[PDB]
Each structure stands twice: as C-alpha cells, then as structure tokens.
Amino acid sequence: SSGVDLGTENLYFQSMPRSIRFTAEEGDLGFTLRGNAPVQVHFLDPYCSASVAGAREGDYIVSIQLVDCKWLTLSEVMKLLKSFGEDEIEMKVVSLL
Amino acid sequence: MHHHHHHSSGVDLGTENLYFQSMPRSIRFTAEEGDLGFTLRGNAPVQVHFLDPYCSASVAGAREGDYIVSIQLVDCKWLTLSEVMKLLKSFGEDEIEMKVVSLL
Description:
The structure is a homodimer.
Chain A: H1 3-15, E1 18-22, E2 31-34, E3 39-44, H2 49-52, E4 60-64, E5 67-68, H3 74-82, E6 89-94
Antiparallel strand pairs in A: 1-6, 2-3, 3-4, 4-5, 4-6
Subunit structure (chain B): Interacts with GTP-bound RhoA and RhoB. Interacts with both GTP- and GDP-bound RhoA. According to PubMed:12473120, it does not interact with RhoA. Interacts with KRT18.
Domain PDZ (chain B): 25-103
Protein name (chain B): Rhophilin-2
C-alpha cells in the first residue's frame, strides 16, 4: 500500500480535533498543563480516565464542550476544568497544531 | 470519597513517559534514492510533518510532530526550515543521524 496514503491519513488523525470524554475521578484530573493559547497536556497519569480516553502527553486542548480554548491561558483552562468537579468533562484535543 | 487503586504508581510511569518524550533521541536513517520520506514544517526548531510509515526514518522511530534538535553534532535548534532541508539534502544517500524530541 501507498506510504503517502497512510502517512497523510495519519496526519489527518493527528491534526483533527478529537473528543475526549472523561472524569476527574475524586477531583483529581490526572494531568498537568503547560503553555498558553492553546494549553498543552504535559504530565499524564496513564491510569486516569483522560488517558484511557486517549488523551496523550503534548496534546493541545482546543475546546471544552462548546467553549473555545484556543486563545485561553493556562490559568483559564485550569479554572474551566476545575468547574466540572467530578462531573463528565468533554474536551477536544489535537496532537498536532 | 477517596478510593485506593491498587496498581503501579501512575506518577512514576507518567513522569517516565515525559522523560522519554522530552529527551533527545538518536534516529539513524537513510534517504533511499535521495527520498527522505518526510516533510518538514516550522522554524527553530523544525518539525517532522508528513511521514511515510515505510521510510527508514519512520522505522527508526521518528514520528509526526517530532522536533529536530540536531543532525550529527550540528545544532538544529535555531535553524530555519530551509537550513534544515539543506543540511539533510547534503547527505545524499549516506547515513543520516539526527536527534529528535517529541515534546519541546
């Protein structure tokens, strides 16, 4: 099969926003965040629900439900995620910006 | 509220993963027929973008989004896309060693 077909398909996958539905079980988000606009997932506990849902280190958070996160600071994205408590969180991430 | 979860430390594993993705790693590969098998994007550092999964760079473990930090003992951290391309072109079909990081 064509390496150009597979590789460009891979690129699409890594570049298109994908939906991660997860919980900060017991308040604990299971990852740290880094940078601004967009903010990036840094440390990620492999056992946490965000990881199990396919979040990865280095992913950029582009939205939390229908709230745009592309232009938000680290502090702002943290405050948004904190607001969910233990309820269901949906965010979209991209592995390549 | 809090439950104990019996398994290895997620913090141990996660921080180890971060080290792996953050420390420069050596990729030794060849551009068979001068065909490098990947495109490049951005500046200082330049990033691997498209990557043919059949190419030697891929087989060596390069990935999409990796940042090129060195080519042999030439520092690439501050180089433009054009400069990095000219460096890689210079190898022709000879062995290329570059170091990449997955997280910058």
